[PDB]
Amino acid sequence: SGAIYVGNYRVVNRHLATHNDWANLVWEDSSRDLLVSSTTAQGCDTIARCDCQTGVYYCSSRRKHYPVSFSKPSLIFVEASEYYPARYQSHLMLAVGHSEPGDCGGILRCQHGVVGIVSTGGNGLVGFADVRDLLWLDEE
């Protein structure tokens, strides 16, 4: 589990969105595994605006933050899970690292701010849904 809290937005994995998220919906995209809902309180996270390929992510199944190198956001074929059939996921970045299904929502960050959230995993790989192209998260 986990979310990004930027301005009056909450960014979560679409497959983990709650009824309150769907009832206060701003934007959602199943191909990216992302959903954004509106919040009453202002958040403290800042979004990175960059092309970094090194950063740190939080792994809840280890209670640890790990430094990683990750690929640029791409269209990758991801195997079936309990939330999606095997399909192409867009705007996804891969790294070598531990993950498990409940690690989704952990933040990946670089020197400039939040880069994305854990979305996919298996066999010593972790995949992150990028948010750096969502420029509108920084305003209104």
Ligand X SMILES: Cn1ncc(C(=O)NCCc2cocn2)n1
- Binding-site residue numbers for Zn(2+) are 50, 52, 110, 112
- 101 scored as a contact of ligand X (CB under 6 A): yes
The residue at minimum Cβ distance from ligand X is: 121
- 5 scored as a contact of ligand X (CB under 6 A): no
Listed in sequence order, the residues at least 6 apart from 123 whose beta carbon sits closer than 8 Å to its beta carbon are none
Of 43-51, 108-116, 118-126, 131-139, the window that binds ligand X (rule: CB under 6 A) is: 118-126
Q: Assign 73 to helix, strand or coil.
A: coil
Between 36 and 75, how does the x/- string for binding to Zn ion read (CB under 5 A)?
------------x-x-x-----------------------
What does 124 interact with, of ligand X, Zn ion, none (CB < 5 to 8 A by kind)?
A: none
d(CA 32, CA 72): 14
Task: Report the half-sphere exposure of 106 (CA within 13 A, side-chain side).
Answer: 27
Q: Which of 135, 9, 27, 34 is nearest to 91 (CA)?
A: 34
User: Which residues belong to the active site?
Assistant: 15, 33, 104
